Design an enzyme around this catalytic site. Structure first.
Site, PDB file in Angstrom:
ATOM      1  N   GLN B 415       1.031  -1.275  -0.041  1.00 46.67           N
ATOM      2  CA  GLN B 415       0.145   0.114   0.431  1.00 46.67           C
ATOM      3  C   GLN B 415       0.635   1.214  -0.226  1.00 46.67           C
ATOM      4  O   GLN B 415       1.699   1.302   0.883  1.00 46.67           O
ATOM      5  CB  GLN B 415      -0.627   0.575   1.154  1.00 46.67           C
ATOM      6  N   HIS B 417      -0.102   4.925   0.377  1.00 43.66           N
ATOM      7  CA  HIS B 417      -0.301   6.041   0.355  1.00 43.66           C
ATOM      8  C   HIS B 417      -0.110   6.650   1.530  1.00 43.66           C
ATOM      9  O   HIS B 417       0.371   6.730   1.684  1.00 43.66           O
ATOM     10  CB  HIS B 417      -1.972   4.641   1.052  1.00 43.66           C
ATOM     11  N   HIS B 514      -4.611  -8.056  11.419  1.00 43.21           N
ATOM     12  CA  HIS B 514      -5.467  -9.388  10.276  1.00 43.21           C
ATOM     13  C   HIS B 514      -4.673 -10.366  10.649  1.00 43.21           C
ATOM     14  O   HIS B 514      -4.405 -11.810   9.754  1.00 43.21           O
ATOM     15  CB  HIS B 514      -4.615  -9.076   9.215  1.00 43.21           C
ATOM     16  N   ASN B 557      -5.454  -7.782   2.856  1.00 45.26           N
ATOM     17  CA  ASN B 557      -6.610  -7.100   4.071  1.00 45.26           C
ATOM     18  C   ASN B 557      -7.979  -8.424   3.940  1.00 45.26           C
ATOM     19  O   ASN B 557      -7.878  -8.423   2.721  1.00 45.26           O
ATOM     20  CB  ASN B 557      -7.031  -5.710   3.708  1.00 45.26           C
TER      21      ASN B 557
HETATM   22  C1  LIG Z   1      -7.791   0.947  11.980  1.00 43.31           C
HETATM   23  C2  LIG Z   1      -8.050  -0.520  11.314  1.00 43.31           C
HETATM   24  C3  LIG Z   1      -7.732  -0.444   9.560  1.00 43.31           C
HETATM   25  C4  LIG Z   1      -8.709  -1.300   9.194  1.00 43.31           C
HETATM   26  N1  LIG Z   1      -8.442  -1.849   7.838  1.00 43.31           N
HETATM   27  C5  LIG Z   1      -8.653  -2.827   6.965  1.00 43.31           C
HETATM   28  C6  LIG Z   1      -8.972  -2.153   5.898  1.00 43.31           C
HETATM   29  O1  LIG Z   1      -7.877  -1.646   5.867  1.00 43.31           O
HETATM   30  N2  LIG Z   1      -8.601  -3.014   5.127  1.00 43.31           N
HETATM   31  C7  LIG Z   1      -9.295  -4.934   6.066  1.00 43.31           C
HETATM   32  O2  LIG Z   1      -9.353  -5.559   5.188  1.00 43.31           O
HETATM   33  N3  LIG Z   1      -9.326  -4.943   6.937  1.00 43.31           N
HETATM   34  C8  LIG Z   1      -9.213  -3.974   7.847  1.00 43.31           C
HETATM   35  N4  LIG Z   1      -8.870  -3.479   9.348  1.00 43.31           N
HETATM   36  C9  LIG Z   1      -9.639  -5.035  10.045  1.00 43.31           C
HETATM   37  C10 LIG Z   1     -10.947  -4.653   9.494  1.00 43.31           C
HETATM   38  O3  LIG Z   1     -11.710  -3.414  10.838  1.00 43.31           O
HETATM   39  C11 LIG Z   1     -11.573  -6.265  10.283  1.00 43.31           C
HETATM   40  O4  LIG Z   1     -11.001  -7.222   9.809  1.00 43.31           O
HETATM   41  C12 LIG Z   1     -13.586  -6.203  10.226  1.00 43.31           C
HETATM   42  O5  LIG Z   1     -14.298  -5.706  11.597  1.00 43.31           O
HETATM   43  C13 LIG Z   1     -13.416  -7.571  10.275  1.00 43.31           C
HETATM   44  O6  LIG Z   1     -14.972  -7.482  11.543  1.00 43.31           O
HETATM   45  P1  LIG Z   1     -16.096  -9.363  12.361  1.00 43.31           P
HETATM   46  O7  LIG Z   1     -17.468  -8.119  12.237  1.00 43.31           O
HETATM   47  O8  LIG Z   1     -15.534 -10.135  11.638  1.00 43.31           O
HETATM   48  O9  LIG Z   1     -14.825  -8.499  13.777  1.00 43.31           O
HETATM   49  P2  LIG Z   1     -15.260  -7.437  14.582  1.00 43.31           P
HETATM   50  O10 LIG Z   1     -15.070  -5.684  13.441  1.00 43.31           O
HETATM   51  O11 LIG Z   1     -13.742  -6.922  15.184  1.00 43.31           O
HETATM   52  O12 LIG Z   1     -16.256  -6.683  15.221  1.00 43.31           O
HETATM   53  C14 LIG Z   1     -16.546  -7.805  16.458  1.00 43.31           C
HETATM   54  C15 LIG Z   1     -17.613  -7.034  17.704  1.00 43.31           C
HETATM   55  O13 LIG Z   1     -18.066  -8.271  17.912  1.00 43.31           O
HETATM   56  C16 LIG Z   1     -18.296  -7.716  19.418  1.00 43.31           C
HETATM   57  N5  LIG Z   1     -18.131  -8.357  20.242  1.00 43.31           N
HETATM   58  C17 LIG Z   1     -17.090  -9.204  21.085  1.00 43.31           C
HETATM   59  N6  LIG Z   1     -16.975  -9.858  21.705  1.00 43.31           N
HETATM   60  C18 LIG Z   1     -18.432 -10.280  22.206  1.00 43.31           C
HETATM   61  C19 LIG Z   1     -19.330 -11.214  22.753  1.00 43.31           C
HETATM   62  N7  LIG Z   1     -19.039 -11.957  23.223  1.00 43.31           N
HETATM   63  N8  LIG Z   1     -20.303 -10.132  23.261  1.00 43.31           N
HETATM   64  C20 LIG Z   1     -21.157  -9.549  22.155  1.00 43.31           C
HETATM   65  N9  LIG Z   1     -20.686  -8.945  21.508  1.00 43.31           N
HETATM   66  C21 LIG Z   1     -19.549  -9.308  21.268  1.00 43.31           C
HETATM   67  C22 LIG Z   1     -17.225  -6.542  19.576  1.00 43.31           C
HETATM   68  O14 LIG Z   1     -18.027  -5.453  20.223  1.00 43.31           O
HETATM   69  C23 LIG Z   1     -17.261  -5.743  17.705  1.00 43.31           C
HETATM   70  O15 LIG Z   1     -18.100  -4.829  18.039  1.00 43.31           O
HETATM   71  C24 LIG Z   1      -8.630  -2.533  10.177  1.00 43.31           C
HETATM   72  C25 LIG Z   1      -8.818  -2.911  11.217  1.00 43.31           C
HETATM   73  C26 LIG Z   1      -8.431  -1.548  12.298  1.00 43.31           C
HETATM   74  C27 LIG Z   1      -8.329  -1.181  13.455  1.00 43.31           C
HETATM   75  O1  LIG Z   2      -1.776  -0.030  10.562  1.00 40.98           O
HETATM   76  C1  LIG Z   2      -2.185   0.037   9.186  1.00 40.98           C
HETATM   77  C2  LIG Z   2      -2.971  -0.588   8.566  1.00 40.98           C
HETATM   78  O2  LIG Z   2      -4.139  -1.473   8.832  1.00 40.98           O
HETATM   79  C3  LIG Z   2      -5.048  -2.960   8.740  1.00 40.98           C
HETATM   80  O3  LIG Z   2      -5.470  -2.990   9.444  1.00 40.98           O
HETATM   81  C4  LIG Z   2      -5.107  -2.652   7.786  1.00 40.98           C
HETATM   82  O4  LIG Z   2      -5.335  -3.867   6.743  1.00 40.98           O
HETATM   83  C5  LIG Z   2      -4.112  -1.781   6.469  1.00 40.98           C
HETATM   84  F1  LIG Z   2      -4.273  -1.541   6.058  1.00 40.98           F
HETATM   85  C6  LIG Z   2      -3.642  -0.382   7.546  1.00 40.98           C
HETATM   86  O5  LIG Z   2      -2.944   0.193   6.330  1.00 40.98           O
END
Ligand SMILES: Cc1cc2nc3c(=O)[nH]c(=O)nc-3n(C[C@H](O)[C@H](O)[C@H](O)COP(=O)(O)OP(=O)(O)OC[C@H]3O[C@@H](n4cnc5c(N)ncnc54)[C@H](O)[C@@H]3O)c2cc1C
Ligand SMILES: OC[C@H]1O[C@@H](O)[C@H](O)[C@@H](F)[C@@H]1O
Ligand SMILES: Cc1cc2nc3c(=O)[nH]c(=O)nc-3n(C[C@H](O)[C@H](O)[C@H](O)COP(=O)(O)OP(=O)(O)OC[C@H]3O[C@@H](n4cnc5c(N)ncnc54)[C@H](O)[C@@H]3O)c2cc1C
Ligand SMILES: Cc1cc2nc3c(=O)[nH]c(=O)nc-3n(C[C@H](O)[C@H](O)[C@H](O)COP(=O)(O)OP(=O)(O)OC[C@H]3O[C@@H](n4cnc5c(N)ncnc54)[C@H](O)[C@@H]3O)c2cc1C
Ligand SMILES: OC[C@H]1O[C@@H](O)[C@H](O)[C@@H](F)[C@@H]1O
Ligand SMILES: OC[C@H]1O[C@@H](O)[C@H](O)[C@@H](F)[C@@H]1O
Lengths: 578, 578, 578
Positions: B415, B417, B514, B557
């Site tokens: 990336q 960016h 990840h 990602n």
């Molecule tokens: C700053 C940042 C940037 C990112 N950028 C990218 C990107 O560019 N591309 C990419 O592919 N991924 C990226 N990610 C990763 C991405 O955010 C996650 O892969 C994605 O949100 C996964 O979704 P999910 O629903 O599987 O898990 P989550 O988004 O983590 O959702 C889990 C939810 O479950 C809830 N929970 C957990 N345990 C319990 C419980 N037992 N009871 C009730 N609720 C519960 C939590 O509160 C949370 O709200 C990034 C992450 C961050 C932090």
């Molecule tokens: O730490 C930032 C990185 O976080 C990761 O979770 C994202 O997938 C990347 F794209 C992003 O740049």
């Protein structure tokens, strides 16, 4: 501390007066005294570092290498303190930064009332500076602390190539070659050059052999060789004697005959030279040297010839000061020596450290190269005593000392080693046995606009005119710098990963202290300060010395080459005033 | 904030129970309620991020991206705080360090009486940790602050090449291919992917066009492409609306009929799942969801089907904790789910920032690519307006959003960016327009020994079993990471030089977030936790969701791909309980 | 985030228009909607935090203190990230610092061609700045992060004693006391001041009682009391609910009668109040209010009365920007309101943290005061559950909340607590149970020269005139500041030793955010802008709200007092516009 050399006498003129007790200044001393010339040498700093030798009841010899002392052999990391303690920075620009969290009752600078910082230079534009350019004062100059690496400068096959490191001594190529070969051989013997002093370190061989194997299986082949060092390993191989001014001057203390032809006044400042007259463009001569005793009195010292060998910055500072015979950012005009302080050149340096690949510990335990029975023994032995050591490298195995010689293909100088002059906090969670330094030095085109000037109304700590730098790289200087970074990143990653805090980076300009071209010497009289015997144009009895005489843009360490000019200039002095 | 919506009734069992309101869990909620199923979802975090839409008279919608508030649209460098403030580190290992400068009268740790500090984890061996792995708790999961990059995974043309990014859903290449084609196309419509939102950025085109030109003409070609992003540029092009949970959950809030089939419980801890029995090897059913209200009172929640979409860490947690019906460092055995938390993967990351070469500013003033009127137009206006500025790029010009598609010959994801999640000090002196980030994420081979486990006696801040990581890479993982480092350095130096402070460096393991393969789903029953529809082996009403179902070592990602598994799982559900 | 509340009528004259949805702004909206007035509220920021309060069936309420989420209660450390993410620095001075280790090929600033950086104010003298002065945008404004301390301001026993915290609201001693008394009681209720919410903390009682004990033995006695906090402990004692705007605005979302007279325009910039005319010193009146919807467009908005409650900066900003109806360091003149942004005052602050004495854990294991059996039981249970723990204090125990009230003989405000707003790197080696924060606040005398002014030619990120500080405290403020620092050291060392990193220091001017006096109100018409009712001079429908109204040099946290002013004001809009 006051050397009991030959005592100064007035109105019985010396043959050679010499300013500066650097290795270069010392070279004039040894050779002229060798020629039964009578020599008076002054040195602004102190006699700070000694060794002893029998007379031909033992004789102190100054200008020894401080790294030689055993506490620095047992503990190399401590030595960076001596270096930082030695170095005095040439040009520190002023500033007026606001400290937001001062107790409101305390003394404070304001917008219209900044502090007056002693020593700082009001004329220095911080954007065209060599902020890390610095000098050392003391007998031996920078040599009581130096890295001791002495390569030759590169000579391209086409004598008319666009670029060369090694300056021309003559317009006849067969002849140029001829002189340099003689000068180079001699300088090597003067300073004690060797490339075999690390041939029995495990690290050195590991790094060297592997890099050679790696880079023959490559698109572009690169040749790795032992950094030529001015030193000799001692009969106890845990130790090394690093060379400095002491081996040059040695016989001037040790030989009663020579001892009588040599005077050295320490803590004496050569303030300026007084000329017969002060008219530009016509023949002239030095009358005497204004020397000042600094121990808490003023001396006119006469001699038939004169040498300024005070290092690249200071040498020009004397000749600049000498222009004053006995608005506020005004500099001292040097019309008597028009080319003074012009065409100055200094090396960009990139730096990183890596941690050796664990893959290579296997190598250490089972090396594929032949005639390594010593290595296998040292290793096998070490792992006896320390069965649980991740690293099978013996505890006091010497550091690597590897270089890549410059080529027009890759126009920069590379050092693959461990330097005593660390650039940050010692990495406390990583073993030292597996750290390797990389330092890549670039070169800079000589241009007129690039200048070292000297301020009329500003004085350094020693009452001499304040140096001011006006240095800006050229556009091809910058393309090369970038290629150099790339080269370093590639090369280093072939055997290790960047040790955190020591990632790929440019160092502050001037850090290498290879500033050159301040009193430049060559065949083009119009653009130089001096000829190829380092004689100053229009002055029969006045000579310069040091890295400032080097007229080229070069990448390698300059000392060995500046010694060549000292030999040459010494022979001209001998052949004129014998 | 108790969301005004269909209030909990404990006399009508639901069709679907979902734990986790992430984007993956909300993919279930949307597809299921679309198919007239009645869905109950619990979120353990709060509803803190809202936008407001009209009903199908303004309904508040949760899981809106925090970066969309104008404050952050106008000051992006501030958003890193939001990120840090929502990250909750998973496994902090114990330490007992001597602080030598304490006032000697104050409460202190000693060698034998070390502090007991709430939250840290006594089981974690720091050397195998994933120190930076963390979680966000709230509606949207991590999606309320994510960087939004949504690429696809790589499939080698050979459907049986030794390594692949995209997991197999069939043993037929053509069926497998066809399934993925469909999944990806929905996912991108659910998440709102788009590769054109930066097509009119100068910075973006400069990086992309120059990088392609350089590599179209190089020994080994590399293609640069717009990084696919889940967002859209609004009609005041300074603003971008980043996409999150809110666009997925949208219908369930705005369609009065979908209103009634959807219950959302925030600040509700899905403590565990109670089964009908706890014997391993034979079929089983999720009896009910054990669930707590955390604000000032326990709730069995019965439903036809149960989905854990709790992020890759908390999902394994809930299941692990479900192995308890309702030596100090012993873990919770998982016999009902034999491969749970095993085979985990995370990505090694390298990082650096460069400042653009100043010759490229010439390019900006005068672009070599034909027919780019709009570029010349923006540039002209800025140089008009700020004639003085050394940078000809206009002030509110968008960052670059460039990528390089994973290839088997260059097995990592890049990336090029600007990320809101900055990694250190915010550069005081350098102008942000000319700064570019580099992030290279490698892959790690799924290995059995690489585990994720949970403690019986250690509980995090929410009384759930403490995660412990046992992760070590492989020799091949390591070898790739070196090449990844080498490659980041070569690429970055083509258009810019390292910004001091952001030189080539590896990040702390787990910073990618990840993490994956904590609940692995695939064809080989004996090594996975679920099948290709992400139903847990031996439970016909239990489904898993999120990055942990992914069973391959991947470098891109993961969110988009996980949404693909959510859809496939939501179909398998629907075509059962519908 | 557009709210459900009463529609926007461009025909009807609203009764009262309000700029700013902070606590002061919310107070006008309450007291006025209560008295049957239709009110339009415009907020420049979004709606970040909400809670649910059932209607007279859950209704969302904006202005919820962000610390109330269970995240920032199970982990208070994390909250400073929220505070930093929220604050936007008012005045940042330009600079041209030389980066000395830039790659020489990259884009660079120079001596006479520096970077032009968006948002630096070129008119700011860094020496006369409040460099930490910042604003917060959103519904609730600063009350969604505030520390909630609400002390009364000091009134001295003499009525003509040289100094007072509390402003004169009459020349009648008896009447002043009476108004404030009922204003304070009313204000205390709106926001909900309680001095009892920490009466069952072990830590709070230890510090409170010990200090009182110790200082009953001392030469000059000092009285320690519970710091009056706008909060209440929840029925679960681990959780606390901090008060904010939401509880001032509750009625207007929870009562349909109320809600129907309240319009809330978030993301809406109140750019300026356009006036009848522009003749200086002659009765005037607002005509309309200009308002910009900042969403992807101008909007005239009509009402009878107008309230500016935008802060102390943004409020005085708004008025100056109105002076423009519809050298380059020049500022907007304010001839209609001669005193706009003059006599400004801010509080010096000293800070440190201590670690408690080991001798005090004995007091905890065995406390000597009557009626502390609840304490003893907690200690027993903890020590039983945690044998090897040097800290007898239990894991969830609330922090201290102790104050010393301003007196004339020690004229500064003192807080001995734990603040969510940490000031540097949280130390990971010391347990937070024995850490105590010290924040002393001085007062600066109002002088006319001390100014906040506004740039004609530089805008902030929301297109409003850049604010510029001209502040220098006097010889008295400095002397008091010195005794304050000394008092802090003396007092802190009575119970513990300075934590490393958190030794006694002054903080950057402005950090306290108790900037006041920008729009000062009193009984000298010439040296104020408005009167004791906050009615701007010569305008009959123009009132001001926030800390800016406070006309005096005070040291205590000011919100309560301003809340008082927002009541006295809100009443005078009602008895004129009845
Ligand atoms: C700053 C940042 C940037 C990112 N950028 C990218 C990107 O560019 N591309 C990419 O592919 N991924 C990226 N990610 C990763 C991405 O955010 C996650 O892969 C994605 O949100 C996964 O979704 P999910 O629903 O599987 O898990 P989550 O988004 O983590 O959702 C889990 C939810 O479950 C809830 N929970 C957990 N345990 C319990 C419980 N037992 N009871 C009730 N609720 C519960 C939590 O509160 C949370 O709200 C990034 C992450 C961050 C932090
Ligand atoms: O730490 C930032 C990185 O976080 C990761 O979770 C994202 O997938 C990347 F794209 C992003 O740049
Ligand atoms: C830490 C370090 C490591 C180095 N490593 C290497 C290396 O590996 N290879 C290499 O080639 N070079 C290296 N150098 C640089 C090298 O030492 C110089 O090239 C060399 O010292 C130059 O010798 P010189 O006599 O011309 O000048 P100097 O060594 O500077 O000696 C000049 C002397 O003149 C004195 N002086 C100055 N002004 C006056 C005055 N007004 N009156 C009287 N005396 C005066 C000074 O006190 C000084 O003693 C290193 C330098 C340092 C600091
Ligand atoms: C972290 C922190 C802790 C604090 N702790 C305490 C404490 O313990 N005790 C205490 O007394 N004080 C404390 N304060 C100060 C306290 O928060 C303020 O005094 C209080 O919020 C005063 O509120 P106000 O409504 O008058 O101004 P603000 O809260 O700043 O609100 C003014 C509102 O006007 C809006 N606005 C500005 N310009 C425009 C525009 N023209 N158009 C539309 N809207 C606009 C802004 O968005 C803002 O929301 C603290 C402050 C902070 C930041
Ligand atoms: O700063 C260290 C460098 O200084 C230079 O002066 C030396 O010549 C190098 F050898 C050395 O590595
Ligand atoms: O910086 C934190 C401080 O902020 C101030 O604005 C508050 O009034 C204090 F109570 C608080 O301690």
């Amino acid at each position: 501390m006051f050397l009991d050399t030959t005592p100064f006498r007035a109105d019985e003129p010396y043959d050679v007066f010499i300013a500066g007790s650097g290795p270069i200044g010392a070279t004039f001393a040894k050779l002229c005294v060798d020629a039964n010339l009578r020599v008076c040498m002054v040195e602004i700093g102190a006699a700070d570092s000694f060794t002893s030798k029998p007379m031909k009841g033992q004789v102190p010899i100054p200008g020894y290498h401080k790294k030689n002392e055993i506490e620095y052999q047992k503990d190399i990391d401590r030595f960076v303190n001596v270096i930082k303690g030695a170095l005095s920075t040439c040009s520190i620009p002023t500033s007026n930064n606001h400290i937001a969290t001062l107790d409101p009752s305390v003394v404070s600078n304001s917008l219209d009332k900044p502090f007056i910082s002693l020593g700082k230079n009001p004329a220095q534009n911080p954007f065209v500076n060599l902020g890390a350019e610095a000098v050392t004062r003391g007998v031996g100059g920078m040599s009581t602390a130096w890295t001791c690496a002495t390569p030759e400068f590169f000579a391209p096959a086409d004598f008319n190539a666009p670029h060369r490191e090694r300056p021309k001594l003559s317009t006849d190529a067969a002849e140029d070659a001829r002189i340099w070969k003689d000068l180079y051989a001699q300088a090597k013997e003067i300073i004690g050059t060797s490339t075999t002093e690390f041939d029995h370190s495990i690290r050195h061989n590991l790094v060297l052999r592997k890099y050679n194997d790696i880079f023959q299986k490559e698109n572009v082949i690169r040749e790795f060789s032992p950094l030529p060092l001015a030193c000799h390993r001692l009969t106890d191989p845990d130790y090394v004697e690093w060379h400095a001014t002491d081996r040059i001057l040695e016989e001037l203390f040790t030989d009663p005959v020579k001892r009588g032809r040599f005077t050295l006044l320490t803590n004496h400042r050569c303030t300026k030279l007084v000329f017969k007259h002060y008219r530009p463009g016509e023949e002239n001569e030095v009358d005497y040297a204004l020397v000042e005793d600094l121990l808490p009195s003023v001396k006119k010292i006469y001699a038939r010839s004169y040498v300024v060998a005070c290092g690249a910055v200071a040498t020009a500072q004397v000749l600049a000061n000498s222009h004053i015979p006995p608005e506020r950012d005004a500099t001292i005009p040097t019309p008597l020596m028009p080319m003074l302080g012009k065409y100055i050149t200094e090396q960009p340096m990139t730096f990183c450290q890596v941690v050796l690949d664990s893959s290579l510990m296997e190598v250490v335990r089972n090396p594929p190269w032949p005639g390594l029975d010593w290595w296998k023994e040292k290793v096998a032995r070490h792992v006896e005593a320390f069965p649980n050591d991740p690293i099978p490298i013996p505890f006091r195995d010497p550091e690597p000392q590897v270089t890549i010689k410059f080529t027009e293909e890759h126009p920069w100088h590379v050092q693959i080693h461990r330097d005593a002059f660390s650039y940050g906090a010692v990495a406390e969670n990583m073993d030292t046995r597996v750290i390797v330094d990389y330092r890549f030095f670039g070169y800079t085109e000589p241009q007129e606009a690039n200048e070292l000037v000297f301020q009329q109304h500003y004085r350094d700590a020693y009452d001499m005119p304040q140096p001011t730098f006006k240095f800006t790289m050229s556009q091809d200087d910058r393309a090369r710098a970038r290629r150099m970074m790339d080269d370093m990143c590639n090369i280093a990653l072939k055997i290790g990963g960047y040790l955190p805090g020591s990632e790929p980076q440019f160092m502050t300009p001037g850090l290498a202290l290879h500033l050159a071209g301040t009193t430049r010497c060559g065949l083009d009289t119009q653009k130089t300060v001096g000829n190829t015997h380092c004689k100053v144009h229009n002055f029969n009895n006045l000579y310069v010395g040091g890295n400032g005489v080097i007229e080229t843009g070069f990448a390698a360490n300059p000392t060995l080459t500046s010694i060549c000019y000292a030999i040459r200039a010494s022979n001209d002095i001998i052949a004129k005033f014998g």
